[PDB]
Amino acid sequence: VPFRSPSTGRNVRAVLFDTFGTVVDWRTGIATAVADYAARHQLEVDAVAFADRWRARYQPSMDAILSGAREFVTLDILHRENLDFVLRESGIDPTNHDSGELDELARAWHVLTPWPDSVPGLTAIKAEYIIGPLSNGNTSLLLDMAKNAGIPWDVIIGSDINRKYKPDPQAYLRTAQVLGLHPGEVMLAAAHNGDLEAAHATGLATAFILRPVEHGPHQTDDLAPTGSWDISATDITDLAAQLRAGS
Amino acid sequence: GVPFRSPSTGRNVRAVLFDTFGTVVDWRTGIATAVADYAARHQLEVDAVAFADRWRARYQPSMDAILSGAREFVTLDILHRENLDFVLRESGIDPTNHDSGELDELARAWHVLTPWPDSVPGLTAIKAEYIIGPLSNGNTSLLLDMAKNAGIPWDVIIGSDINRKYKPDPQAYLRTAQVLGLHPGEVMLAAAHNGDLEAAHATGLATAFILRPVEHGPHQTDDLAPTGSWDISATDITDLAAQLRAG
Ligand SMILES: [Cl-]
């Protein structure tokens, strides 16, 4: 018997996931690949900090397109442009380096490791619900990641299918509609209250997944829920159990 | 394991994508049964198989209206509910004296079909080394509904309504490969219909024939063997899986 949302009054039929941070540990993976690049190419970097500088270009690089100032391109292109960007700020010229080797680095985001609860939790949720990402990633990045890591999604509606980024209302609404589901039949699971806010504002069920070290041991934000989401959870294993109790 | 290189495209295959109705699931028995059940619950009389085969007759014609430019694209769901009305009329029934919502339920019977027995295990084995999903005229929500009721283990579902194209419109194939980040030559079309495989060969995709001699029952005339020089000709999806591993 599915979980009926208190906030939205409908029976959940899809639990879709924010992917970076919520499902996979982006930072460990980005720092890793950066450290490997750094050693191989004789650079002198704080790999961890470099990953943090590369992530901090994510929203601004998306902000340009959200506002209409730039025409939609895929997260893979943004990620690549932001890497150049972060190199130069670190005082390294890109074309001093091989372009295809830097694309490879840029696709490190395709190759990310789940949190230890992710695959087991998602495996259990898949038995009772449609699962899939609800993510700024484009379809091919998300799919590469799902295949590499064995993330068992049923469906992949990438941002490049809606031609929209979160938190643009149409990110949520269009996903719900291509899946054949009223917004309120669709729960968004996310480690980020902001994303949950915007999900709620569209009329989606919400679930908060605490992720205290997404950003390292000195993380500041999203350390608890700042909203009355349907579910608050310590991981996706907890999400599955709470989905099963009902409302 | 070492990937299957298409002789026709020369490229290593990375995605094996499937025509679904017929190639993977036995639509005919599925629709026959559902009709017979609606028939009996609303006290009418009909050759439920025949009605099924007429409902199927209205598939390509309902699409050709969109393929020619003569009509604005819509979801196969909408098309199927319209053709239901059509076939009812042909069978002497007037749709206005039935509950709209009950007919909307009958039209979504294409979402509840049974895989051929060889399908789920064959796909499971291919999933372990390749991307798998449909390449089909079904819309996403329909095909997802189907995957969920029957455990068809797709990695990704690019429905016809994502490409806003219907097969064999060469764009249908090309937008699928694109959205997956793959060169057309890296995608294989597995189909039990030679005219779909020909449309996809001519667009540059790799090819697999799967023999389904009873898709239209014992009195099936069509597609009772491979008419092209396809990469793979198979007896079933499990055979396809084995040939893929063979190389
Ligand atoms: Cl995301």
Domains of chain A, by residue range, sit at: 1-40+112-247, 41-111
B contacts of A161 (beta carbons < 8 Å)? 162, 179
Spatial distance between the Cα atoms of A231 and A240, rounded to a whole number of angstroms: 10
Q: Is B76 within 8 Å of chain A by CB? A: no
Cβ neighbours around B172 below 10 Å, total = 23
Angle between helix B194-202 and B170-179 (nearest 10): 70
Whether domain A41-111 has CATH 1.10.357.10: the reply is no
Spatial distance between the Cα atoms of A211 and A217, rounded to a whole number of angstroms: 11
Q: Is A154's CB within 8 Å of B159's CB?
A: no
- Letter for the amino acid at B242? A
Cβ–Cβ under 8 Å, residues B187 and B197: no
Q: Is B140's CB within 8 Å of A181's CB?
A: no
Classify B234 as helix, strand or coil: strand
CATH number assigned to the domain covering B42-112: 1.10.150.240
Chain discontinuities in chain A, listed by preceding residue (C to N exceeding 2.5 Å): none
Structure tokens, A190: 């996310």
DSSP letter for A224, please: S
CATH topology for A1-40+112-247 is: Rossmann fold (3.40.50)
Q: Which of B132, B157, B183 to mutate to test the interface with A (most CBs of A within 10 A)?
A: B157
Looking at the DSSP bridge assignments, the partners of residue A131 are A15
Cβ–Cβ under 8 Å, residues A118 and A24: yes
B131, B144, B158 ranked by CB distance to A179: nearest? B144
The structure tokens 């060969």 sit at: B201
The two beta strands, A130-133 and B187-191, are unpaired
Q: Is B68 exposed, middle or buried (0-12, 13-18, 19+ CB in 10 A)?
A: exposed
Q: Is A140's CB within 8 Å of B181's CB?
A: yes
CA dihedral B190, B194, B195, B199 (to 10 degrees): 50
Q: Is A130 within 8 Å of chain B by CB? A: yes
Q: Is A161's CB within 8 Å of B141's CB?
A: no
> Are domains A1-40+112-247 and A41-111 of this chain identical in fold?
no
- Exposure pattern of A200-234 as b/e (b: 16+ CB <10 Å)? bebbbbbbbbebeebbeeeeeebeebeeebbbbbe
Q: Which residues surround ligand 1, an ion (CB under 5 A)?
A: A 18-20, 135-136
DSSP letter for A95, please: G
Cβ–Cβ under 8 Å, residues B140 and B162: yes
Cβ–Cβ under 8 Å, residues B152 and B123: yes
DSSP letter for A72, please: -
A contacts of B156 (beta carbons < 8 Å)? 139, 143, 153, 155-156
Spatial distance between the Cα atoms of B28 and B49, rounded to a whole number of angstroms: 7
Closest CA to A120 of A210, A235, A12, A230: A235
Give the CA count within 13 Å in the CB-facing half-sphere of B213.
7
Q: Which of A76, A135, A143, A161 to mutate to test the interface with B (most CBs of B within 10 A)?
A: A143
- Letter for the amino acid at A210? L
Q: Which residues contact B28 (CB under 8 A, 6 or more apart)?
A: B49, B52, B53, B56, B215, B216, B217
Spatial distance between the Cα atoms of A13 and A129, rounded to a whole number of angstroms: 5
B contacts of A144 (beta carbons < 8 Å)? 181
Q: Is B154 within 8 Å of chain A by CB? A: yes
Whether domain B1-41+113-247 has CATH 3.40.50.1000: the reply is yes
- Exposure pattern of B100-120 as b/e (b: 16+ CB <10 Å)? eeebeebbbbbbbbebbebbb
Cβ neighbours around A36 below 10 Å, total = 13
Resolution attained, angstroms:
2.2
